[PDB]
């Protein structure tokens, strides 16, 4: 695993909150729309233009908690979680989590899962708020052991159904396995397939399944992915499609143009998804990151984002912490 493939997750996952901001939620966003804003936003003469959301502040929570407390301290996360929530409540937190932030802001609990436990009348979050953060474990962590208990630790500080959690240790796998040197798309999904049947045993199985067999049709339209993968604030609504985005733009898509690179088209690709477009696309492009690297996130994309000085300096931070568990 080198400096690039950090980098680069980190990278694109910023770019792809950042990119993904606005259209979130967005019944109307299609293709031309996506493609008009990426033209523009390359001439644009300022840099920073683009805020992040929630996406990446509880990401660089998870980073800050990582790099204090490399043995991982589930403790110290939950509290950098409420903190950035008290300090920054605007960046669009889902309307669920936020009681969660506010019990743990609280003197009451003292054990920083009973909050999550008791979201949805005790059934716990199901949304993709759990996985939108999680890529960071994969680049700390490299026995995939590791990657699991804390990916689904990270997770369970906020979300607390196995829909919720499993969500968050898939993506934690996706980046994991994309890390792998290049490895080959069959591979790639036979590897996450393998690790979730053991996990699940199942509704993440059944959608990279799914996966799999869109990947063996060609011109599939995007109201198929939609329909059957989703494009939702539910973690099984938004990680396989995001995972699909990453595996679908391994290749030449014929509605983009083929100037862009992989994981521009990944990134592309994933707003013109609709519905969720910050954490699709921050899911997709932290996979693309990791397997393509820094080498595809270009200067004119990443000036336009918001911390990504702070973003680059603190991947250069995870890669040691990798490097040190070997
Ligand atoms: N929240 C948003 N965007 C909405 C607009 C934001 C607005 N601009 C603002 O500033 O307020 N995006 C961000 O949140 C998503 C992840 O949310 P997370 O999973 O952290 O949230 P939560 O746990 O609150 O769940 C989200 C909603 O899912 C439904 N839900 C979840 N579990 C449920 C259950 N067991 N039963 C019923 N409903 C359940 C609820 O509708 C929750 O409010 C990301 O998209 C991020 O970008
Ligand atoms: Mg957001
Ligand atoms: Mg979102």
């Given at each position: 695993v080198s400096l690039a493939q950090v980098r680069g997750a980190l990278c694109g996952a910023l770019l792809g909150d950042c990119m993904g901001a606005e259209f979130?939620?967005?019944?109307?966003?299609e293709l031309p729309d996506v493609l008009e804003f990426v033209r523009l936003l390359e001439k644009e003469?300022?840099?920073?233009?683009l805020f992040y959301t929630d996406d990446t502040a509880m990401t660089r929570a998870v980073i800050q908690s990582l790099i204090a407390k490399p043995d991982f301290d589930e403790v110290d996360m939950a509290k950098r979680f409420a903190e950035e929530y008290k300090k920054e409540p605007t960046r669009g937190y889902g309307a669920g989590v936020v009681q969660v932030f506010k019990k743990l802001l609280s003197?009451?609990?003292?054990?920083?899962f009973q909050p999550a436990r008791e979201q949805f009348d005790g059934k716990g979050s199901y949304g993709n708020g759990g996985a939108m953060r999680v890529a960071s474990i994969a680049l700390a962590y490299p026995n995939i052991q590791d990657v699991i208990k804390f990916a689904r630790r990270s997770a369970q500080?906020?979300?607390?159904s196995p829909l919720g959690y499993n969500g968050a240790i898939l993506q934690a796998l996706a980046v994991h396995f994309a890390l792998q040197?290049?490895?080959?798309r069959d591979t790639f999904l036979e590897q996450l397939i393998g690790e979730m049947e053991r996990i699940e045993g199942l509704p993440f199985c059944s959608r990279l399944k799914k996966i799999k067999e869109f990947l063996a049709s060609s011109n599939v339209p995007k109201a198929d992915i939609v329909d059957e993968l989703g494009h939702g604030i539910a973690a099984l609504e938004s990680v396989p499609t995001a995972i699909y985005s990453f595996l679908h733009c391994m290749e030449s898509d014929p509605?983009?143009?083929?100037?862009?690179?992989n994981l521009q088209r990944t990134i592309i690709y994933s707003i013109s998804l609709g519905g969720d477009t910050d954490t699709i696309a921050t899911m997709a492009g932290a996979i693309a990151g990791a397997y393509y690297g820094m080498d595809q996130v270009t200067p004119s994309w990443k000036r336009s984002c918001e911390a990504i000085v702070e973003t680059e300096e603190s991947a250069v931070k995870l890669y040691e912490l990798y490097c040190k568990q070997l």
């Open positions: 979130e939620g967005s019944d109307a966003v003469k300022k840099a920073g233009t003197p009451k609990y003292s054990d920083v500080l906020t979300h607390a040197g290049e490895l080959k509605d983009i143009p083929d100037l862009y690179n």
